[PDB]
Coordinates of C-alpha atoms and ligand atoms in Angstrom, one line a residue:
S1 CA 384.4 104.1 136.6
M2 CA 381.7 101.6 135.0
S3 CA 378.4 102.9 136.1
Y4 CA 377.6 99.3 137.8
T5 CA 379.5 96.7 139.5
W6 CA 377.5 93.6 140.1
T7 CA 377.8 90.4 142.1
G8 CA 375.6 87.9 139.9
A9 CA 373.1 88.4 142.8
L10 CA 369.3 89.0 140.9
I11 CA 367.1 92.3 141.1
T12 CA 364.3 91.2 142.3
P13 CA 360.6 91.0 142.8
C14 CA 359.1 92.7 146.1
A15 CA 355.7 91.7 145.1
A16 CA 353.7 88.6 142.7
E17 CA 354.3 90.7 138.8
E18 CA 352.0 90.4 136.0
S19 CA 352.8 91.0 133.4
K20 CA 349.3 91.2 131.0
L21 CA 346.6 92.1 130.3
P22 CA 344.3 90.9 133.1
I23 CA 341.2 91.2 130.4
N24 CA 337.8 92.6 131.2
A25 CA 334.2 92.8 130.4
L26 CA 335.4 96.5 130.6
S27 CA 338.5 96.8 129.3
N28 CA 337.7 94.9 126.0
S29 CA 335.3 97.6 125.5
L30 CA 338.3 100.2 124.7
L31 CA 341.0 97.8 123.3
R32 CA 341.5 94.3 121.3
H33 CA 344.2 92.8 120.7
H34 CA 345.4 92.9 124.1
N35 CA 347.7 90.1 123.8
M36 CA 350.2 93.4 122.3
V37 CA 350.1 94.9 126.2
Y38 CA 352.2 94.0 128.4
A39 CA 354.4 95.1 131.9
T40 CA 357.1 94.7 133.0
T41 CA 359.2 92.8 135.6
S42 CA 361.7 91.8 137.0
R43 CA 362.0 89.0 134.1
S44 CA 363.9 91.3 132.7
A45 CA 366.2 92.7 134.4
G46 CA 368.9 91.2 133.4
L47 CA 368.9 92.6 130.2
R48 CA 368.4 96.2 131.3
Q49 CA 371.4 96.2 133.7
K50 CA 373.2 94.5 131.2
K51 CA 372.5 97.9 128.5
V52 CA 372.7 99.9 131.2
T53 CA 376.5 99.6 132.7
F54 CA 379.7 101.2 130.6
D55 CA 382.6 102.7 131.2
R56 CA 382.4 106.7 131.5
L57 CA 384.9 109.5 129.5
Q58 CA 384.7 112.6 130.6
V59 CA 386.5 115.6 128.7
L60 CA 385.9 118.5 129.8
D61 CA 386.1 122.1 127.8
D62 CA 386.4 126.0 128.3
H63 CA 382.8 126.2 127.2
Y64 CA 381.6 123.7 129.8
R65 CA 383.5 125.8 132.5
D66 CA 382.2 129.2 130.5
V67 CA 379.1 127.9 131.3
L68 CA 379.5 126.6 134.5
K69 CA 380.4 130.3 135.7
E70 CA 377.4 131.8 134.3
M71 CA 375.1 128.4 135.9
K72 CA 376.8 129.6 139.6
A73 CA 377.3 133.0 139.3
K74 CA 372.8 133.1 138.0
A75 CA 372.7 130.0 141.1
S76 CA 374.5 132.3 144.3
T77 CA 370.6 134.7 143.5
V78 CA 369.1 132.1 145.8
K79 CA 367.9 131.9 149.1
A80 CA 366.8 128.1 149.7
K81 CA 365.2 126.7 153.3
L82 CA 365.5 123.9 155.3
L83 CA 362.3 122.6 155.8
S84 CA 360.8 121.0 158.7
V85 CA 360.2 117.5 159.8
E86 CA 357.4 118.8 159.5
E87 CA 356.2 119.7 156.6
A88 CA 358.9 117.0 154.6
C89 CA 356.7 114.3 156.6
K90 CA 353.7 115.8 154.4
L91 CA 355.2 115.6 151.1
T92 CA 355.5 112.0 151.6
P93 CA 353.0 110.3 149.3
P94 CA 350.7 107.8 151.7
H95 CA 351.3 104.1 149.5
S96 CA 355.2 104.5 150.0
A97 CA 358.2 102.5 150.5
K98 CA 357.7 101.4 154.3
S99 CA 361.3 102.0 156.6
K100 CA 363.2 98.9 156.6
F101 CA 362.9 100.4 160.5
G102 CA 359.6 99.4 161.9
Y103 CA 358.3 102.7 160.5
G104 CA 355.5 103.4 157.2
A105 CA 354.5 106.2 155.2
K106 CA 351.4 106.6 157.3
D107 CA 353.6 106.9 159.9
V108 CA 356.1 110.0 158.7
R109 CA 352.2 111.6 157.5
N110 CA 350.8 111.3 160.8
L111 CA 354.0 112.2 162.7
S112 CA 354.8 109.0 164.2
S113 CA 356.2 109.6 167.4
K114 CA 358.8 106.6 166.7
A115 CA 359.1 108.1 162.6
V116 CA 359.9 111.1 164.0
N117 CA 363.2 110.1 165.7
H118 CA 364.3 107.5 163.8
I119 CA 364.8 110.5 160.6
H120 CA 366.0 112.6 163.5
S121 CA 369.1 110.6 163.8
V122 CA 369.1 110.1 160.2
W123 CA 369.8 114.0 160.1
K124 CA 372.2 114.0 162.9
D125 CA 373.8 110.9 160.9
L126 CA 374.4 112.9 158.4
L127 CA 375.1 115.6 160.1
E128 CA 378.7 113.6 162.1
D129 CA 379.0 111.2 159.0
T130 CA 379.5 112.7 155.4
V131 CA 381.4 109.5 154.0
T132 CA 379.8 105.9 154.9
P133 CA 377.6 105.5 151.4
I134 CA 374.0 105.2 152.4
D135 CA 372.3 102.1 151.1
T136 CA 369.4 102.1 148.7
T137 CA 367.4 98.8 147.2
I138 CA 367.0 98.5 143.5
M139 CA 363.8 97.4 142.4
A140 CA 362.7 96.6 138.3
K141 CA 359.6 99.2 137.5
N142 CA 356.6 97.8 136.3
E143 CA 355.2 100.0 133.4
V144 CA 353.1 98.5 130.4
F145 CA 353.3 99.8 127.0
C146 CA 352.7 97.9 123.1
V147 CA 354.6 95.2 121.4
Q148 CA 357.1 97.3 119.3
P149 CA 356.5 98.0 116.2
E150 CA 357.5 94.8 114.9
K151 CA 356.2 91.7 116.0
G152 CA 358.3 90.7 118.4
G153 CA 360.2 93.7 120.1
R154 CA 360.1 94.7 124.1
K155 CA 360.9 96.9 126.4
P156 CA 363.6 95.5 129.4
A157 CA 362.3 97.0 132.6
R158 CA 363.2 100.5 133.8
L159 CA 365.2 100.0 137.2
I160 CA 364.5 102.3 139.9
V161 CA 367.3 102.8 143.0
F162 CA 366.2 104.5 146.1
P163 CA 367.4 104.9 149.3
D164 CA 365.4 104.2 152.9
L165 CA 362.4 106.1 153.5
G166 CA 364.1 108.0 156.2
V167 CA 366.8 109.3 154.1
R168 CA 363.9 110.3 152.4
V169 CA 362.5 112.2 154.2
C170 CA 365.9 114.0 154.9
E171 CA 366.0 114.6 151.4
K172 CA 363.0 117.1 151.6
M173 CA 364.1 118.8 155.3
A174 CA 367.7 120.1 152.8
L175 CA 367.1 120.0 149.5
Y176 CA 362.8 120.8 148.7
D177 CA 362.9 124.1 148.5
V178 CA 366.3 123.9 146.1
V179 CA 365.4 122.1 144.1
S180 CA 362.0 124.0 143.3
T181 CA 363.1 127.1 143.7
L182 CA 367.3 127.0 141.7
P183 CA 366.7 125.3 138.7
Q184 CA 364.1 128.0 137.0
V185 CA 366.4 130.9 138.4
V186 CA 369.7 128.7 137.0
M187 CA 367.8 128.8 133.6
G188 CA 365.4 130.7 132.7
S189 CA 363.1 130.0 130.5
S190 CA 364.9 126.9 129.5
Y191 CA 363.7 124.8 132.8
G192 CA 361.0 122.9 131.3
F193 CA 359.0 121.8 134.5
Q194 CA 358.1 125.5 135.0
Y195 CA 355.3 125.2 132.1
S196 CA 352.1 123.9 131.7
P197 CA 351.0 122.0 128.6
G198 CA 349.5 125.4 127.1
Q199 CA 352.6 127.5 127.8
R200 CA 355.4 124.7 126.9
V201 CA 352.8 124.4 122.9
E202 CA 353.4 129.0 123.3
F203 CA 357.1 128.9 124.3
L204 CA 357.9 126.8 121.3
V205 CA 355.9 128.5 118.6
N206 CA 356.2 131.5 119.8
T207 CA 360.5 130.9 119.7
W208 CA 359.7 128.8 116.1
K209 CA 358.8 132.7 115.3
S210 CA 360.6 134.2 116.6
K211 CA 364.1 133.0 114.4
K212 CA 364.4 134.6 110.9
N213 CA 365.1 131.5 109.8
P214 CA 364.3 128.5 112.4
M215 CA 366.0 125.3 112.9
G216 CA 365.2 123.1 115.5
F217 CA 366.2 119.9 117.2
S218 CA 365.9 116.8 119.8
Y219 CA 368.5 115.2 121.4
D220 CA 368.5 112.0 123.0
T221 CA 371.2 110.6 124.7
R222 CA 371.7 106.6 125.9
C223 CA 370.9 105.6 129.3
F224 CA 371.5 109.3 130.6
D225 CA 371.4 108.5 134.4
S226 CA 374.6 105.5 133.2
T227 CA 376.2 108.9 131.9
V228 CA 375.9 111.0 134.8
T229 CA 380.0 111.0 136.6
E230 CA 380.3 111.3 139.6
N231 CA 382.3 114.9 138.4
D232 CA 379.0 115.2 137.3
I233 CA 377.0 115.3 140.9
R234 CA 380.0 117.0 142.8
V235 CA 379.7 119.6 140.2
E236 CA 375.8 119.9 141.3
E237 CA 376.2 120.0 144.5
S238 CA 379.0 122.8 144.3
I239 CA 375.2 124.5 142.1
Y240 CA 373.8 124.1 145.5
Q241 CA 375.4 125.2 148.0
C242 CA 375.9 128.6 146.0
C243 CA 372.7 129.3 147.5
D244 CA 372.8 131.3 150.7
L245 CA 371.9 128.4 152.2
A246 CA 372.1 127.3 156.6
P247 CA 375.0 126.4 157.9
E248 CA 373.3 122.8 158.6
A249 CA 371.6 122.3 155.5
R250 CA 375.3 122.7 153.6
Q251 CA 375.9 119.7 156.0
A252 CA 373.4 118.0 154.3
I253 CA 373.6 118.5 151.0
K254 CA 377.4 118.3 151.6
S255 CA 376.6 114.7 152.7
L256 CA 373.5 113.6 151.0
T257 CA 376.2 114.0 148.1
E258 CA 378.9 112.0 149.1
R259 CA 377.0 108.9 151.2
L260 CA 374.5 109.2 148.6
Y261 CA 374.0 110.9 145.5
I262 CA 377.2 109.9 144.1
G263 CA 377.3 106.1 144.5
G264 CA 377.1 103.5 146.6
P265 CA 375.7 100.2 147.7
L266 CA 372.4 98.2 145.3
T267 CA 370.6 95.3 147.4
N268 CA 368.1 93.6 146.0
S269 CA 364.3 92.8 147.8
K270 CA 365.7 89.9 149.6
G271 CA 368.6 92.1 151.3
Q272 CA 371.6 90.0 149.4
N273 CA 373.9 92.6 147.6
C274 CA 374.1 93.0 143.9
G275 CA 376.5 95.8 143.4
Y276 CA 377.7 98.8 143.0
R277 CA 376.4 102.3 141.3
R278 CA 378.3 105.5 140.4
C279 CA 376.0 107.1 138.3
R280 CA 373.0 108.6 138.9
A281 CA 370.6 107.2 141.3
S282 CA 367.1 107.3 139.5
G283 CA 365.1 107.3 142.5
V284 CA 366.0 110.0 145.4
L285 CA 364.6 114.0 144.8
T286 CA 367.4 115.5 143.1
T287 CA 367.6 113.1 140.1
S288 CA 365.2 115.5 138.3
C289 CA 366.8 118.4 139.1
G290 CA 370.4 116.6 138.5
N291 CA 369.5 115.4 135.9
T292 CA 368.3 118.8 134.0
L293 CA 371.1 121.0 135.4
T294 CA 373.8 118.7 134.0
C295 CA 372.0 118.5 130.6
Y296 CA 371.8 121.8 130.8
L297 CA 375.6 122.2 131.1
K298 CA 376.4 120.0 128.7
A299 CA 374.1 121.1 125.7
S300 CA 374.4 124.8 126.9
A301 CA 378.0 124.2 126.3
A302 CA 378.3 121.8 123.4
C303 CA 376.1 124.9 121.6
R304 CA 379.2 127.3 121.8
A305 CA 381.0 124.9 120.6
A306 CA 379.5 124.8 117.4
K307 CA 376.4 127.2 116.5
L308 CA 377.1 130.9 115.9
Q309 CA 373.4 131.6 115.8
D310 CA 370.6 131.9 118.8
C311 CA 370.5 128.9 120.3
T312 CA 366.9 128.7 122.2
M313 CA 367.1 125.5 124.2
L314 CA 364.3 124.2 126.9
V315 CA 365.1 120.9 128.8
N316 CA 363.2 118.8 131.1
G317 CA 365.9 116.1 132.7
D318 CA 367.4 113.9 130.0
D319 CA 364.6 115.8 127.7
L320 CA 366.9 118.0 125.2
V321 CA 364.8 120.5 122.2
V322 CA 367.1 123.6 121.0
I323 CA 365.6 126.0 118.1
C324 CA 368.2 128.2 116.7
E325 CA 369.0 130.2 113.8
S326 CA 369.7 128.1 110.3
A327 CA 372.8 128.5 108.9
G328 CA 372.1 126.4 105.7
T329 CA 370.8 122.6 105.3
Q330 CA 374.9 121.1 104.5
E331 CA 376.0 123.7 107.4
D332 CA 373.2 122.8 109.9
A333 CA 373.7 119.0 109.4
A334 CA 377.8 119.8 110.2
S335 CA 376.7 121.9 112.7
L336 CA 374.7 118.8 115.1
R337 CA 377.8 116.5 114.2
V338 CA 380.2 119.3 116.3
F339 CA 377.4 119.2 118.8
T340 CA 376.7 115.2 118.7
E341 CA 380.9 115.3 118.8
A342 CA 380.4 117.6 121.6
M343 CA 378.5 115.8 124.1
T344 CA 379.5 113.1 123.0
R345 CA 383.3 114.2 124.7
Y346 CA 381.4 115.4 127.9
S347 CA 379.9 111.7 128.5
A348 CA 376.1 112.5 126.6
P349 CA 376.5 110.4 123.8
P350 CA 373.5 109.9 121.7
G351 CA 371.1 107.2 120.9
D352 CA 369.7 108.7 117.3
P353 CA 372.2 110.5 115.6
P354 CA 371.2 114.3 116.5
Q355 CA 368.4 115.6 113.0
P356 CA 367.9 119.3 111.5
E357 CA 364.1 119.5 111.2
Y358 CA 362.5 122.9 109.6
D359 CA 359.0 122.2 111.1
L360 CA 358.1 122.6 114.7
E361 CA 355.3 120.0 113.9
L362 CA 357.9 117.4 113.3
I363 CA 359.9 117.7 116.6
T364 CA 359.4 116.0 118.9
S365 CA 360.2 116.6 122.8
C366 CA 359.5 114.4 125.8
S367 CA 357.2 112.1 123.6
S368 CA 355.4 115.1 122.5
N369 CA 354.7 117.6 119.6
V370 CA 352.6 120.7 118.7
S371 CA 350.1 120.2 115.5
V372 CA 347.6 122.9 114.8
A373 CA 343.7 122.9 115.2
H374 CA 340.7 125.4 115.6
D375 CA 338.7 126.6 118.0
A376 CA 334.8 127.3 117.9
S377 CA 335.9 130.8 115.8
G378 CA 337.5 129.3 112.8
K379 CA 341.2 130.6 115.0
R380 CA 344.0 128.3 114.5
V381 CA 345.2 127.2 117.4
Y382 CA 347.9 124.8 118.1
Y383 CA 348.5 122.0 121.3
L384 CA 350.1 120.0 122.3
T385 CA 349.5 116.4 120.9
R386 CA 351.0 113.1 121.8
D387 CA 351.1 109.0 119.5
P388 CA 348.3 107.5 121.6
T389 CA 349.6 103.9 121.8
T390 CA 351.4 104.1 125.2
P391 CA 348.5 106.3 127.0
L392 CA 345.8 103.6 125.0
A393 CA 348.1 100.8 126.4
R394 CA 347.7 101.7 129.7
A395 CA 344.5 103.0 129.9
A396 CA 343.4 98.8 128.8
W397 CA 345.6 98.0 131.6
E398 CA 344.5 101.0 134.1
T399 CA 340.2 99.0 133.1
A400 CA 341.2 95.4 133.8
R401 CA 343.2 96.0 136.6
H402 CA 343.3 98.5 139.9
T403 CA 346.5 100.6 139.5
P404 CA 347.9 103.2 142.8
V405 CA 348.9 105.8 139.7
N406 CA 346.1 105.7 137.0
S407 CA 347.5 107.5 133.6
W408 CA 344.3 108.0 131.6
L409 CA 343.7 110.8 134.4
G410 CA 347.3 112.3 134.2
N411 CA 347.0 112.7 130.1
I412 CA 343.2 113.6 129.6
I413 CA 344.7 116.3 132.3
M414 CA 348.0 116.7 130.6
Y415 CA 346.3 116.2 127.0
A416 CA 342.9 117.5 127.1
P417 CA 343.1 119.2 124.1
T418 CA 343.7 115.7 121.7
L419 CA 341.2 114.4 119.1
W420 CA 342.1 110.7 121.0
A421 CA 341.6 111.9 124.3
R422 CA 338.6 113.9 124.2
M423 CA 337.3 111.0 122.1
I424 CA 338.3 108.1 123.8
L425 CA 340.1 108.7 127.1
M426 CA 337.4 111.1 128.1
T427 CA 334.1 109.2 127.3
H428 CA 335.5 105.1 128.4
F429 CA 336.4 106.6 131.7
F430 CA 333.4 108.6 132.4
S431 CA 331.6 106.1 130.7
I432 CA 333.7 103.5 133.4
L433 CA 333.1 105.9 136.2
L434 CA 329.5 106.7 135.2
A435 CA 328.5 103.4 136.4
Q436 CA 330.2 102.5 139.4
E437 CA 329.4 105.9 140.8
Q438 CA 332.8 106.3 140.8
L439 CA 332.2 110.2 140.6
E440 CA 333.7 112.0 143.3
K441 CA 336.0 109.6 144.1
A442 CA 339.5 111.7 143.8
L443 CA 341.7 109.7 142.0
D444 CA 345.9 110.0 142.1
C445 CA 347.9 111.0 139.1
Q446 CA 350.9 112.4 138.5
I447 CA 352.7 115.5 136.8
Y448 CA 356.6 116.0 136.4
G449 CA 356.7 113.0 139.1
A450 CA 354.9 114.7 142.0
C451 CA 351.7 112.6 142.7
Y452 CA 348.1 114.9 143.4
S453 CA 344.6 113.5 144.3
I454 CA 342.5 114.8 141.9
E455 CA 337.8 114.6 141.8
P456 CA 337.6 113.8 138.6
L457 CA 334.5 116.0 138.2
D458 CA 337.2 119.2 138.5
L459 CA 338.2 118.1 135.2
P460 CA 336.1 121.3 133.7
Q461 CA 337.9 123.5 136.1
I462 CA 340.9 122.1 135.9
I463 CA 341.6 122.3 132.0
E464 CA 340.1 125.8 131.3
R465 CA 342.6 126.5 133.5
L466 CA 345.8 125.0 131.7
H467 CA 344.3 124.6 128.4
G468 CA 341.8 127.3 128.3
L469 CA 338.0 127.1 126.8
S470 CA 339.1 126.6 123.3
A471 CA 340.0 122.9 124.8
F472 CA 336.4 122.3 124.5
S473 CA 336.2 123.6 121.2
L474 CA 339.4 121.9 118.9
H475 CA 338.0 120.5 115.4
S476 CA 339.8 121.1 112.3
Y477 CA 342.6 118.6 113.1
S478 CA 345.5 118.3 110.9
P479 CA 344.8 115.2 108.6
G480 CA 348.9 114.2 109.9
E481 CA 347.4 114.0 113.6
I482 CA 344.3 112.2 112.1
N483 CA 345.3 109.5 110.4
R484 CA 348.6 109.0 113.8
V485 CA 345.3 108.1 115.9
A486 CA 343.1 106.1 113.5
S487 CA 346.7 104.2 112.7
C488 CA 346.7 104.1 116.3
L489 CA 342.5 102.7 116.8
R490 CA 343.2 99.9 114.0
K491 CA 347.0 98.2 115.6
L492 CA 345.6 98.3 119.0
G493 CA 342.0 97.3 118.2
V494 CA 340.6 100.2 119.4
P495 CA 336.7 101.0 117.3
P496 CA 336.7 103.7 115.6
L497 CA 336.7 107.3 115.9
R498 CA 332.9 107.4 114.8
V499 CA 331.8 104.7 116.8
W500 CA 333.7 107.3 120.7
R501 CA 331.1 110.1 118.6
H502 CA 328.2 107.6 119.2
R503 CA 329.0 106.4 122.4
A504 CA 330.2 109.7 123.6
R505 CA 326.3 111.4 123.1
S506 CA 324.9 108.9 125.7
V507 CA 327.6 109.3 128.3
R508 CA 327.3 112.9 128.1
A509 CA 323.4 112.2 128.1
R510 CA 323.7 110.7 131.0
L511 CA 326.9 113.4 133.1
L512 CA 323.3 116.4 132.8
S513 CA 320.8 114.3 133.8
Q514 CA 322.9 114.6 137.2
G515 CA 322.8 118.5 137.1
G516 CA 325.3 120.4 139.4
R517 CA 328.8 118.8 138.2
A518 CA 328.5 116.2 136.2
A519 CA 326.3 118.2 133.8
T520 CA 329.2 120.6 133.9
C521 CA 332.2 117.3 132.8
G522 CA 329.2 117.2 130.5
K523 CA 328.4 120.0 129.0
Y524 CA 332.0 120.8 128.4
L525 CA 334.1 117.8 127.9
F526 CA 331.7 116.5 125.8
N527 CA 329.9 118.6 123.7
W528 CA 331.7 117.9 120.8
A529 CA 330.1 115.2 120.1
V530 CA 326.8 116.7 119.2
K531 CA 325.5 117.7 116.6
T532 CA 324.4 120.9 117.3
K533 CA 327.1 122.9 119.5
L534 CA 325.9 124.5 122.4
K535 CA 327.9 128.0 123.1
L536 CA 330.1 127.6 126.2
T537 CA 330.2 130.6 128.3
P538 CA 333.9 130.4 130.8
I539 CA 332.9 128.4 133.5
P540 CA 332.4 130.5 136.3
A541 CA 333.5 128.1 139.2
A542 CA 337.1 128.3 137.9
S543 CA 339.2 130.4 139.7
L544 CA 346.4 124.9 140.6
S545 CA 350.2 127.2 140.6
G546 CA 352.1 124.6 142.6
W547 CA 351.2 122.6 139.6
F548 CA 354.0 123.2 137.0
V549 CA 356.3 125.2 139.5
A550 CA 359.6 121.8 138.8
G551 CA 359.5 118.1 138.4
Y552 CA 360.2 115.2 140.8
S553 CA 360.5 112.6 138.8
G554 CA 361.6 109.5 141.2
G555 CA 361.4 112.3 143.9
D556 CA 359.3 111.2 146.8
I557 CA 356.4 114.1 146.0
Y558 CA 353.2 113.9 147.1
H559 CA 350.6 117.1 147.0
Ligands
LIG1 O1 353.1 111.7 128.1 C1 354.3 112.5 128.9 C2 355.6 113.4 128.4 O2 356.0 114.2 129.2 C3 355.6 115.8 128.6 C4 353.6 116.8 128.3 C5 353.7 117.9 128.4 C6 354.6 118.3 128.6 CL1 354.0 120.1 129.1 C7 355.9 118.5 129.4 C8 356.3 116.7 129.0 N1 353.7 113.5 130.3 C9 352.1 113.1 130.3 C10 351.5 112.0 130.1 C11 350.4 111.8 131.4 C12 350.1 112.8 133.1 C13 352.0 112.9 133.3 C14 353.2 113.0 132.6 C15 354.1 114.3 132.6 O3 354.8 114.5 131.9 O4 353.9 114.2 134.1

């Protein structure tokens, strides 16, 4: 069936949209070519709708069914519990979209009389009605990027599709536990969200060394969400049902599936009807989990339809990477062809055709790759890096304009070992926070879809905990990585690494002169900037688990 049926009504903004870098005094200190940093808006939604709309075809295999059965067998190992309205209410982000029925996220968090009651009726309703499609709103996301390599190329807005607040709270009550528990049990170590960046690099590096003759590849499917068939959503519903669940939970989950997850009517911000969705919704609590289970089911099947080798996959929603035993150059290449044919047959066709790689550092999944550096003791150390462009792009925007979720902080957390995060992002923002006396101010950032409130002065403890003390000592970065950064610094008009050294010696000096927590930030985060480096002892006050358990992208999770 068609992933989308449109009425011709337009996907419309709810708030004025800014599309250009709101240039600043401070902003210009970070980036110069402010005319290569845009933000997506409603304007380009028509384009997105065209790319994301298409007919789907699926042809299941015995390979597919065998894997489904194993998954199910494994799923029937889990016992999930239903959340109390209190529990589900607390997990709601403070800024969450207000309900069309009078109350808001603030009321939900306070357990307001009217809030809980609407929630209680949406629940009762779900239990009584298992057929009326539930209404959802469709919006065009406002994310910023840097202009496509070639001067021109812009990204057309991504589309978010979500139900009413009251429903969202109901999703938490019935599936939150399933969604942060079942995925790992079913896919074991293949479940990507159970790892912190360091753990991911360790799993990829060892899996690569474990192979006698290693081959690896990342698979990029086109509009995964659109490729998700109604049947895919029901199959995934059956996997949740394999858990030991409460009678009401099975009922709430069965209904959410038939009324919301399988598909439903789309409504723009002006209450106008936009069309109908017969695929995954980017804005529900199961988007991430559904996508990971489904992507994993197809990829695994697709592996059997090829490899006579020892596959190890890492799956993060629609992101996939497999490392197996090479069977030779021309033979491996054949295998990926079959793999792609298999995946396409399951309604998961490729954007770019997958390419056999024989160098782990050349593989990129989750827009990241493994790279090598050295720690204080000279030892070789692997860490996860990224192409700094979007992070730098979004840092500039976040300097010039006030954002609800700020990526610079999350990038620092996810990429504390990189030379760009360490030298530019850290140096830039601690400088700003210093100037404006905002060091104690908790800020909101996101990890694996979930929103968190982090105090920038904890970065040290946080980083040692996730990356280890060595995140403060890496120094012999790859000629490759170094060029990548410098080259991007060129393109964006970001001052050279050499300037960041000086700036950071300054920032490190200010932090120190305030002792306590800022000095700790100065002592550990900028030890790289000083000439005569001083040794760093395991941070005492640094001894987070709920941080890398599961994925909640599009979900409505707060912590
Ligand atoms: O750029 C990426 C690409 O995604 C990953 C990076 C590292 C790991 Cl271990 C997994 C996904 N991630 C982020 C960057 C800043 C903040 C949050 C995130 C996130 O994935 O939650």
